[PDB]
Amino acid sequence: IVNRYEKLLSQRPEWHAPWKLSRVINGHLGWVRCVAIDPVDNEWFITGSNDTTMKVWDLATGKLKTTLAGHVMTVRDVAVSDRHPYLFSVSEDKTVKCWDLEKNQIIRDYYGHLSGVRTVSIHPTLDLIATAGRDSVIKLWDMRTRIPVITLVGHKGPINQVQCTPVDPQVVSSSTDATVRLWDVVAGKTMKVLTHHKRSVRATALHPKEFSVASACTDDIRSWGLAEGSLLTNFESEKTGIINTLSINQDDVLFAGGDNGVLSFYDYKSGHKYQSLATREMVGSLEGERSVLCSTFDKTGLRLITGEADKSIKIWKQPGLAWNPN
Template identity: 60%
Template sequence: MTSSPASADILVRNSRKRTRELFGSDYTSPAPYFKDSPEDPLYLAERAGLAARIRSEYDHVRELPPALAAKQKAATAARRKKPRQEEPESSTAKMIEDIPQKSLSNRSPSTALSLRTSQAPTNPNTSTRGGLPSSSLVRRENIQQPKPEWHAPWELMRVISGHLGWVRAFAVEPNNQWFASGAGDRTIKIWDLASGSLRLTLTGHISTVRGLAVSPRHPYLFSCGEDKMVKCWDLETNKVIRHYHGHLSGVYTLALHPTLDILVTGGRDGVARVWDMRTRSNIHVLSGHKQTVSDLTCQAGAEPQVITSSLDATVRLWDLTAGKTMGVLTHHKKGVRALAQHPIEWTFASGSTSSIKQWKCPEGAFMQNFEGQNAIINTLSVNEDNVLFSGGDNGSMSFWDWKTGHRYQSLDTTAQPGSLDAESGIFASTFDRTGLRLICGEADKTIKIWRQDPEATPETHPLDWKPTLGRQRF
């Protein structure tokens, strides 16, 4: 007897739907067809899979030993005498009840599970939970990977030349009018942010300038360098008004606390020093790192906190009040060279060789990895639009979505004419106060300013994103 073409089409369509419901959960989150129908293919597929798992995992333990059967019968009778509230039945329990016994086993059904072997000793003190499904039978929910937010791609806007050495540090003025840069030529240059023209050159360091910070409440510019010096510049007279003495070697990084008049510096001697900005007194010496302190950041909150990274492959969280370590993050395998703190959220990122990790303040809970950039990460920057920038020692640049860790743009910087191809490393970066301009300092002695493409739309530059099974947020 041959079936009609119409019935064959129905059989093929039902088979295709059943296959999708069985195997589609490995790649997507299947939505059931005929959701209101009693013969829902998703329900039937889950029931069939559950029956197969019960048969394969528990078929040999379906018969209860006589001693346990008698004890369970007495316990069940005693439980029935006590009034109890009706509990809502779970979907999995209902599904197990709907599975016909012949699909589970050809033997007589049992009300409990036990090991069916003659050598196994019986323990009369053991009890089982009859009638309740095991947690191993519950299908785990598919992990819904969040879709990244769309961001416009970044393009090169301006190249500024003027330094005679590697550009190693940046600081943007709070009013977003100008920014300062420090370089290997021992100078600090003030640039107009709108036009890129040079306003001023400050000289005073006798070695490479490695860190800069502009105070949001005072007309002060702070700088540090490999000459062990930490200087405070008065921007009204453009002269040095304070020195902070104490470091035993080069000072590689510094940061100002957002709300307190406190300056924190770190360097090659492996310690971070906390200074009173006005009196120049050394409040704390945060010692614990075994190698150079490469970067640090301060965050305000209920408990003032300092976060430091080091070439000993650790990140330390410090209690600024007590001057002691709150926690040590040892997830990185190689030296951590860069930190970036989100301007709004209580989160930060740390970068080392081929590894960028995101953390939650203040306890330092790990959140996610940013995977894909195979380079030594020298600098990290993040803006309020949840765009994370990472610059590599080989000139590679990556732009990431802060929420999901998706890399939506990657490119290589171009060394300027007359410089070597090896001079394509990126050493410093920062966003301006609006987050619309990205300033990068490079090994070809130039400053490059990037901006988002103003004509880009989700239609002209669609999001290239595919969810993966192995990657989870937490």
Template identity: 55%
Template sequence: MAEQAAHASAKRTRAVFGADVVEYPSVNIDSPRIATRIHQEYSRVQELPPALAAKMATAASTAAEKRRKIKNANAEEQASDPKMRKMIEASTEKVEKSREAQSMALTLRAGKGAAPNAHGPTPTRDTPSSALVRKDTVRQARPEWHAPWKVMRVISGHMGWVRSLAVEPDNQWFASGSADRTIKIWDLGSGTLKLTLTGHISAVRGLAVSPRHPYLFSCGEDKMVKCWDLETNKVIRHYHGHLSGVYSLSLHPTLDVLVTGGRDGARVWDMRTRTNIHVLSGHKGAVSDVKCQEADPQIITGSMDSTIRLWDLAANKTMAVLTHHKKAVRSLTLHPTEFTFGSASAQSIKQFKCPEGAFMQNFTGHNAIINTLSVNEDNVLFSGGDDGSVSFWDWKTGHRFQATDSIAQPGSLEAEAGVMCSTFERTGLRLITGESDKSIKIWKADENATEETHPLEWKPTLGRRKF
């Protein structure tokens, strides 16, 4: 009964809607309902209206006529000279061939033919290819061999931490400033005390000997910047202006200009008239170290706000701000012959290129708070840590060829083994360090060491260098 009722209903539906049902042979449609909907909705637009069809035909004939006219005009405007006509035809053929040869491939192979490994890896292994392959890191240069350094003399005499050192230009003596508020002059060859200068009322943090005048400059945590006449051993000038402790001091090599840095920023002074020429404002923390050089940037400052600034001295403006360090920059050093400089912070030593301050490389491995850096002409970089650890590096490649600890003097606490300041004397053959066990140590390279007795322990690394 159910089948008969369904059959009767289907017949009745067919009879009612049969006129609307249309067969579409090109479309595989089983349901008459879909075919009916297509007929009802799209039957009126299956063919263009007569007016629109006539307009389309006219437009097509007009376009064909235009193309024919352009072709005839080009044929008429051909060069009269047959040689010129041949040259034009040859150039058009080349252009058409180059267009045909253009490919949408992502890479172009150096040679024509099959892909490098089309027939297996072995036969075409050495086939050159310019495929997009990640290139290997730059091959590392082999470091230069340097003899290990050792302590040759320990000088005692200060009653506090030795915070600053300076060697005079003739290389006869050096000065040391200490937390005992004194400046002592020592004979470089014998290590004997020649003179003690008193006048500061707090730790002496910076020293500099002028190469063009008989002057010694000093600065300290007592806000004072003093100029000492080395002929009379007396203070002849005070530079008043700093509102807090002064941590660093540097002389310009060619101008009569003195630059100091401290808790309230950096200042530029006229050496003769004692006037404050510039206030180098920009750092958000204390200026821990200042360096001067002849060429731009003439002033480089490192700060506890973990930035390094390169200054335009004439315009009193910042040329560049280097933000590579993550922690406070405690020390700077200028290479004596190259146009480069190094900077140190906790567990980080970096090398930069002047004048723009481009980053060059990292010196990794000295895991301490690094208080001081020094470099000599033989490309030996020294770094001294707050825990007494010292490292010697190859300046060119960043290879650490020696790592040792400075031994605190008998009677000192273990915590007093710390290197606070350092400098190479003028020849670069002796290193002077000031330490928190109140001693001054003089280091020299081991004269008996050779490449056979102390081989270079170096292996190239494949890892990418981190900034």
């Protein structure tokens, strides 16, 4: 309609600074298909991989702190907790393990997932984590009693990212069924099922200050306030690659990594793509490989960290692009 387009044209987005590559830390001998940082501090960030390991990394130096070898198969995801000094990690060996960070050694392997487990999210407020695998089910664990407390049946296929919010919409799943769910853990049921994607929403992330949750199928990055479970915006992601990552920055600077490796940045809520970045790879590696598989920002937000399939981790420092809608 003309009534909306005109309005869109009238409104302007804020000039977010562009992004330039800063650090590249070829250290893993495998994909680096998870990355995470400490809520409390931003000194280190760990990165689980197809190595089977996960390595810890000092941001400032870029130096490899230490390794951790508590899986058999490849690590798919990790989550350092704000409220406790535990690092949860999870691998396609079906193990959702829990590393003490006072001793850097596993403690509570949680057992229950029938098959390769894709993501963890620690609940920001509770002493409870949430994991989901190709199982097609998101189980919540009491961390003390290392048992699945509840489980969330709804989904009809493998479930990827499964973020935890502190409100009522306490889990924000995202499947290959292309539904992204909002659940009520307490009710033992769904509350609202965002079906707006076309394909496997293989990426989703909570906004820090804004109580919303960007989510990405093969192209269209939707983003939504999950209070009602209502759409907020659609991003200009029109011919970008298969969106692997979908991290959001503190300053409303949503990042999206592709299977292409084209690092695409967007103003959040606007839905305005305001940068593209061509990937890079090593002289030995192939041009098809290069692809940002996992990524996240620091708590401040000036450094984006992208794990790419070059067996690398690339950290990114910081005139905006013209609007032009449909």
